[PDB]
C-alpha cells in the first residue's frame, strides 16, 4: 500500500490555487482522490492553505454526515464472527478513529465496506455547499 503521492497533492492544491471552490474543484477532487483511504483524504484536506472558513465549513459537514451515518447504521449486538472487523462508525469512515490497517481491511474485505468512497461522498457534499456559497 502506497499513500496518496506528493505529485497528486500538488495537482490537488493547484486545483485549489487556480479554481478555489468553483464547480470545477469537485470533479478534480474526485479524480485526484482516486483509490484514497480516509487517511489520504484527510492528508488532502489538511494540505489546503488559504481557505480557512471554507475548510471549517467542510469539517462541519463531515461531522453532520458522520452523526447521521451512525443514526442510520446502528451496530449489531454481541461479539462478531472470527474477529472479522468491527463495523465502522462515522468517525472511522472519516479516518478519525480508525487505523490505516482498519481502513484497508474494510476496503479490501469480501464483501468490501468502501470507507474511502463513503468519506469522499461526504467531502463532495461539503464542497457542493461551499461552491453554492461562493458562486
Amino acid at each position: 500500500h502506497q499513500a496518496i503521492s506528493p505529485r497528486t497533492l500538488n495537482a490537488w492544491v493547484k486545483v485549489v490555487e487556480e479554481k478555489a471552490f468553483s464547480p470545477e474543484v469537485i470533479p478534480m477532487f474526485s479524480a485526484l482522490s482516486e483509490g484514497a483511504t480516509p487517511q489520504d483524504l484527510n492528508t488532502m484536506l489538511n494540505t489546503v492553505g488559504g481557505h480557512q472558513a471554507a475548510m471549517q465549513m467542510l469539517k462541519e459537514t463531515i461531522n453532520e454526515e458522520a452523526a447521521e451515518w451512525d443514526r442510520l447504521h446502528p451496530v449489531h449486538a454481541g461479539p462478531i464472527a472470527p474477529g472479522q472487523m468491527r463495523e465502522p462508525r462515522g468517525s472511522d469512515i472519516a479516518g478519525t478513529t480508525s487505523t490505516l490497517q482498519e481502513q484497508i481491511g474494510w476496503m479490501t474485505h469480501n464483501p468490501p465496506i468502501p470507507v474511502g468512497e463513503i468519506y469522499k461522498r461526504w467531502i463532495i457534499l461539503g464542497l457542493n455547499k461551499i461552491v453554492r456559497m461562493y458562486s
Binding site: L9, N10, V13, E17, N46, G49
Partner: protein, 102 residues
C-alpha cells in the same frame, strides 16, 4: 505557532551559507508561511516534522524542473525540519545534507 522559544534560539544561530555572515531570522518563517498560502498549501504543516517532511516531498519535483522558483522555500523548510527534528545544523547546506541522506 511554528517554533518554541528553544527552537527559536537554535534557528537564529543558523547560517544561510556555510561560514557565511547572514543567519536565519523569524522573517524567514513568516515569509515561508505566506509563500505556502499563495500556492494554497497549508502553512500549519510547518509546525511539525511530519508536515515539513510532507512539503519537502511536494517541492522536490519542482526543483527537478530547472526552475528555482521554490528554492529558498525549500531551503527554509529543510532547515525547519532539522530544527523540529533536533538535528543540529550550522547552515542551510548542513540541513540539505541531512535531508539528502534521509
Amino acid at each position: 505557532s511554528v517554533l518554541s522559544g528553544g527552537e527559536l534560539d537554535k534557528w537564529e544561530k543558523i547560517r544561510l551559507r556555510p561560514g557565511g555572515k547572514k543567519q536565519y531570522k523569524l522573517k524567514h518563517i513568516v515569509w515561508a508561511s505566506r509563500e505556502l498560502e499563495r500556492f494554497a498549501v497549508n502553512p500549519g504543516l510547518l509546525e511539525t516534522s511530519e508536515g515539513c517532511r510532507q512539503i519537502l516531498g511536494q517541492l522536490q519535483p519542482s526543483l527537478q524542473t530547472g526552475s528555482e522558483e521554490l528554492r529558498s522555500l525549500y531551503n527554509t523548510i529543510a532547515v525547519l525540519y532539522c530544527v523540529h527534528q533536533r538535528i543540529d545544523v550550522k547552515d542551510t547546506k548542513e540541513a540539505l545534507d541531512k535531508i539528502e541522506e534521509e
